[PDB]
Amino acid sequence: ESVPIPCHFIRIGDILILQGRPCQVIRISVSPQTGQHRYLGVDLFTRQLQEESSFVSNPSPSVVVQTMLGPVYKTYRILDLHEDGTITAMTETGDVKQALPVVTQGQLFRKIRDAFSSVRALVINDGRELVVDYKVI
Amino acid sequence: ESVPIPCHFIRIGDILILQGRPCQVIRISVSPQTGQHRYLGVDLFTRQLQEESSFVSNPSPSVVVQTMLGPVYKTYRILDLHEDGTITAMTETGDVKQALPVVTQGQLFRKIRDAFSSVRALVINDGRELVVDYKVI
């Protein structure tokens, strides 16, 4: 449900798993005490602020890596949209999700509506699924 | 010697392995035929231009991932610098590298010289080792 990403690849606006919650990063800093990177983010569901420091590892001699956890993105085929902000989507295997919620970040629904009239929904799981991006394709 | 990175994390200026060579990315585009991402980069050793398209994978149902290969970074303790552009460094195990070359990208040697007067060198292997970044820590 998550994937480790080297910290030097992460930038403001990226989605990370902060304290077990998918969050959009709004600030990145470095700890002068440990050298860890610090990520402040906005919970995509509750809009609460969360912070988490990076995980240091030493897998091989002279190889030290700083990572954060990023969410695994699922692409669903978009079948329909509704006037309440939800969409009807279908998984790769044919499972129909009747009312998937869409984030209000960057007016995502309006862009999906403009593209619908072959759009793919990029969905994040946190049991609750959430459309956080889209791809035309 | 390499690590896969999701394409949406890669930005201009990042170092990738293009056609088996470490390259600094200078342009990113998308193929309208396949949806693959295309990366044009400058070879850090020969200064030649290389291009490579992303690798698509479908590991899990509804999970499609576009990745590129990035180099594994080694951190060496910097022991000395020389007037010819090289540095003396030591690995985590104590192996002394007497004359490690440094890239001229972003005047890296001048920044290392200013920081030396506890600096760590970030080194890339392509048998030939190359200092491509530095860290104070």
Swiss-Prot record, chains A, B:
It is found in: Cell septum; Cytoplasm. Disruption phenotype: Leads to an increased sensitivity to stressors that affect the integrity of the cell wall and membrane, such as SDS, the antifungal agent fludioxonil, the acyclic sesquiterpene alcohol farnesol and the cell wall perturbing agents Calcofluor White and Congo Red. Does not affect the resistance to hypo-osmotic stress but leads to a higher sensitivity to physical damage. Results in the lack of Woronin bodies. Attenuates virulence in a murine model of infection. Disulfide bonds: none annotated. Belongs to the eIF-5A family. Hex1 subfamily. Forms oligomers. Self-assembles into hexagonal rods. Binds directly or indirectly to the Woronin body tether lah. Major component of Woronin bodies, fungal-specific organelles that occlude septal pores in order to separate intact from damaged compartments. HexA binds directly or indirectly to the Woronin body tether that in turn is anchored at the rim of the septal pore. Woronin bodies are important for stress resistance and virulence. This is Woronin body major protein hexA. It comes from Aspergillus fumigatus (strain ATCC MYA-4609 / CBS 101355 / FGSC A1100 / Af293) (Neosartorya fumigata). The gene is hexA. The chain holds residues 391 to 532 of 537 of the full protein.
